[model samples]
Target: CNTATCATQRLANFLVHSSNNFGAILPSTNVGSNTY
Candidate 1:
């Protein structure tokens, strides 16, 4: 779950959803934990 590729995919999804919903940028550092 902590793999780089999976984390990166989640990060991409997080960024897309956050940007689309709130029109804002988010910190990528926070997304890796759930993957881990």
Candidate 2:
């Protein structure tokens, strides 16, 4: 509802489309001790 949260949500939306491989990398990164 706030400006910062709205901006971050928009950024995440853009990142998801731009970084198409994020879905693939997310799981690996999450399981790899979160150091990525």
Candidate 3:
């Protein structure tokens, strides 16, 4: 569970950074879609 949460947190941080950098050109909704 700890490992799973850590990985998820890492992914979330990555997604947030990506979104912040590309959210302008990329649709925010698409970000969520790309996640799953």
Candidate 4:
């Protein structure tokens, strides 16, 4: 439970401010495709 919750914060960080190519992948991968 704790680890799963921690992962959300990390994922959120990448989604919001990681300054990576996340924007490009989000569209092709459908971000929520992870379904973790």
Which one wins by TM-score: 3 or 4?
Answer: 4
Candidate 1, residue 23: how far the Cα is off, in Å: 12
Give each model a TM-score. 0.13, 0.13, 0.12, 0.15
| True-vs-predicted CA distance for residue 17, candidate 4, Å | 1.0
Tens digits of per-residue lDDT for model 1, 1-36: 565544332344332433344323543643445332
lDDT of 1 at 11: 40
> Taking the tens digit of each residue's C-alpha lDDT, what string does model 4 give over 1-36?
453422232244453444555344443332445534
lDDT of each: 0.41, 0.35, 0.37, 0.40
**Candidate 3 all-Cα RMSD:** 9.1
Tens-digit lDDT track for model 2 on 1-36?
Answer: 454433221225433334444334334221235443
- The model with the greater TM-score, 2 or 3, is 2
Kindly indicate the candidate among 1 and 4 with the higher TM-score: 4
Candidate 3: where is the Cα deviation over 4 Å?
A: 1-26, 30-36
lDDT of prediction 3: 0.37
Per-candidate RMSD vs. true structure? Answer: 8.8, 9.1, 9.1, 8.6
| Model 1 segments more than 4 A misplaced | 1-24, 30-36
